[PDB]
Write a protein that holds these residues in place. Structure first.
Motif, mmCIF file in Angstrom:
data_model
loop_
_atom_site.group_PDB
_atom_site.id
_atom_site.type_symbol
_atom_site.label_atom_id
_atom_site.label_comp_id
_atom_site.label_asym_id
_atom_site.label_seq_id
_atom_site.Cartn_x
_atom_site.Cartn_y
_atom_site.Cartn_z
ATOM 1 N N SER A 106 -0.411 7.072 1.923
ATOM 2 C CA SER A 106 -1.729 7.595 2.269
ATOM 3 C C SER A 106 -2.766 6.475 2.383
ATOM 4 O O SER A 106 -3.639 6.523 3.260
ATOM 5 N N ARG A 107 -2.678 5.451 1.527
ATOM 6 C CA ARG A 107 -3.612 4.329 1.624
ATOM 7 C C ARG A 107 -3.399 3.530 2.906
ATOM 8 O O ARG A 107 -4.368 3.065 3.519
ATOM 9 N N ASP A 126 -3.411 13.744 -2.564
ATOM 10 C CA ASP A 126 -2.303 13.153 -3.307
ATOM 11 C C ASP A 126 -2.749 12.654 -4.677
ATOM 12 O O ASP A 126 -1.985 12.727 -5.649
ATOM 13 N N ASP A 147 -6.388 13.080 2.787
ATOM 14 C CA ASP A 147 -4.968 13.123 2.441
ATOM 15 C C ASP A 147 -4.695 12.299 1.190
ATOM 16 O O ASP A 147 -3.892 12.693 0.331
ATOM 17 N N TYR A 148 -5.357 11.144 1.076
ATOM 18 C CA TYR A 148 -5.231 10.332 -0.123
ATOM 19 C C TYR A 148 -5.762 11.065 -1.353
ATOM 20 O O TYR A 148 -5.137 11.041 -2.417
ATOM 21 N N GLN A 150 0.817 -1.211 0.000
ATOM 22 C CA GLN A 150 0.000 0.000 0.000
ATOM 23 C C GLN A 150 0.851 1.261 0.000
ATOM 24 O O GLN A 150 1.948 1.281 0.551
ATOM 25 N N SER A 151 0.332 2.321 -0.610
ATOM 26 C CA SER A 151 1.002 3.606 -0.539
ATOM 27 C C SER A 151 0.895 4.178 0.871
ATOM 28 O O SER A 151 0.155 3.681 1.728
ATOM 29 N N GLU A 208 -9.143 5.537 -8.210
ATOM 30 C CA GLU A 208 -7.734 5.631 -8.585
ATOM 31 C C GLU A 208 -7.534 5.287 -10.059
ATOM 32 O O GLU A 208 -6.866 6.022 -10.802
#
Ligand code: FAD
Length: 499
Positions: free
Chosen positions: A4-5, A308, A304-305, A1-2, A274
């Motif tokens: 933010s994720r 981004d 926040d996600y 996962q990133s 996404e």
């Protein structure tokens, strides 16, 4: 996962003391802003309550309940007599009747200013059984639901748009229908959405994603048994439908908004969003919209996600910030699953704090997000109006409201300053469909309007003072904390599921 994720996943069921404590300073209005928000909120709520002079009339009523020392049933009967006396045409006859000689038809109406049905129900039920109850539920749903529906077909709804659009309102149309159970069901919803986009886009006629109408869709309508659907089949089957609809909306330059549903579908909706934001045919187009629900503990992390994502995909996202429509079902679901906590807050004031904190985060990035602040709450509206700062411009943000609920508040908001309005735009969410598609939406509206915690329910309670009605939620949370011993304790009547 990133990064933010991953943060979203970690906050899923964050303990409520921790989540509320973290949001408090992000939600706190600076003292001068708080004072302006309070005055505007009080003003808006006063005009709401006292349209047609509801309080002033009630005041004159109770004042005469004192001077004569009479009961409520006493006051109503006096008004009925007073009414019948005022119907005597000539004053000399009326006065002589009062002096010498000394009906309740409209007593019910006067009573508004101031048992055996169980037998009829028990009798009717045993005789007619389930088919009777089934028809009564259908009839009640249609009767109570009419006020929330703008038209049976998109053409009918669109044909009514000019009246409010010429006053500065906007629309987002929703073809009612959700939770497709079969492949045929989801196919029918897809066709209904496509037809709607063609119709809305032709009506829009190039007005664009801000001024012109848009559409709202539910992912659960586009995939059979979405509630338990796996990632692989959603990507293979739902996503091509979502892409197809969004490309068509882009051809007409209308906004297309992805409604938010139950909390266990948040993750898969972010995966779909996404992928969608990186479609080459959507490059440079800012009409994709997405709802986020402030009653979720994950909401600030979702922001926040999204920030981004807007940066990486080089677009401005249209983000509808809502509190949330599924709270009752979310609590019940969590209690049945016996997990560590709730994905939503358990006190309404915490959701209010979350909304204000999230609103500040959205307003801070106008290059990345067009915030759409959906609320019928006069304090929430007034807070956002002040938090957005000096020097409003139309593309900064908009308000949103539900058809059949927003009109009395937003009549003070949308329109010219010279006419006493705030000159801020509001987009009306406009459900479209027949009785066969109404049930789930209507139930959520009943829960919203009937809850004693809802602003729309509390403002109709003339025994609740305006100042309590528009009380600042951050201050309310600190008052609870001082009384109870720590900040953000769960609702006393909603223990953790494992209890
Ligand atoms: C135009 C528009 C579009 C919307 N789209 C969506 C959507 O796609 N998905 C969705 O889920 N919602 C959506 N909503 C929101 C939902 O339908 C309600 O309208 C909204 O939550 C009411 O908030 P309010 O500020 O008008 O009322 P307020 O009365 O100030 O707040 C009521 C809300 O508080 C929350 N709440 C109630 N009790 C508690 C409690 N004990 N603890 C914690 N929280 C509590 C609930 O969210 C409830 O709706 C939308 C609303 C509007 C106006």
């Amino acid at each position: 996962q990133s990064v933010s994720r991953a943060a979203i996943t970690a906050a899923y069921r964050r303990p409520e003391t921790e989540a509320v404590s973290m949001l408090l300073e992000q939600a706190r209005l600076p003292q001068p802003v708080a004072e302006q928000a309070h005055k505007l909120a009080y003003q808006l709520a006063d005009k709401l309550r006292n349209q047609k002079n509801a309080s002033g009339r009630a005041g004159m009523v109770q004042g005469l309940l004192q001077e004569f020392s009479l009961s409520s049933q006493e006051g109503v009967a006096l008004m009925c007599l007073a009414e019948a006396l005022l119907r005597i045409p000539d004053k000399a006859t009326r006065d002589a009747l009062i002096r010498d000689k000394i009906l309740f038809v409209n007593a019910a109406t006067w009573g508004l200013l101031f048992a055996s049905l169980s037998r009829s129900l028990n009798r009717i039920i045993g005789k007619s059984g389930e088919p009777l109850i089934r028809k009564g539920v259908d009839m009640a749903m249609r009767l109570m639901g009419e006020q929330f529906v703008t038209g049976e077909t998109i053409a009918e709804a669109l044909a009514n748009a000019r009246k409010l659009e010429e006053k500065g309102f906007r629309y987002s149309y929703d073809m009612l229908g959700e939770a497709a159970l079969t492949a045929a069901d989801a196919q029918a919803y897809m066709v209904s959405y496509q037809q709607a986009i063609h119709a809305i886009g032709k009506a829009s006629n190039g007005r664009g994603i801000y001024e012109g109408p848009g559409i709202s869709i539910k992912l659960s309508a586009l995939h059979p048994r979405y509630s338990r659907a796996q990632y692989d089949r959603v990507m293979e089957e739902l996503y091509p439908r979502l892409k197809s609809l969004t490309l068509l909306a882009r051809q007409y330059d209308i906004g297309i908004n992805i409604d938010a549903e139950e909390s266990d579908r948040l993750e898969i909706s972010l995966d779909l969003l996404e992928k969608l934001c990186f479609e080459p045919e959507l490059a440079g187009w800012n009409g994709i919209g997405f709802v986020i629900q402030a009653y979720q503990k994950r909401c600030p992390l979702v922001i926040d996600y999204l920030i981004d994502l807007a940066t990486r995909s080089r677009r401005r996202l249209m983000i509808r910030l809502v509190k949330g429509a599924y709270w009752d079902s979310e609590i019940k679901r969590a209690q049945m699953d016996g997990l560590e906590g709730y994905p939503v807050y358990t006190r309404k004031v915490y959701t209010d704090v979350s909304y204000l904190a999230c609103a500040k985060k959205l307003l801070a990035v106008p290059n990345l997000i067009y915030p759409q602040f959906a609320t019928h709450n006069a304090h929430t509206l007034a807070a956002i109006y002040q938090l957005a700062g000096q020097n409003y411009y139309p593309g900064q943000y908009e308000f949103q409201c539900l058809h059949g609920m927003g009109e009395p508040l937003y009549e003070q908001v949308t329109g010219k300053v010279a006419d006493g309005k705030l000159n801020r735009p509001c987009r009306i969410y406009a459900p479209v469909g027949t009785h066969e598609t109404l049930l789930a939406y209507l139930v959520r509206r009943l829960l919203e309007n009937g809850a004693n915690t809802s602003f729309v329910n509390r403002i109709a309670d003339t025994s609740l003072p305006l100042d309590e009605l528009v009380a600042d939620p951050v201050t309310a949370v600190e008052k609870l904390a001082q009384q109870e011993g720590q900040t953000g304790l769960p609702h006393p009547k909603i223990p953790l599921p494992r209890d």
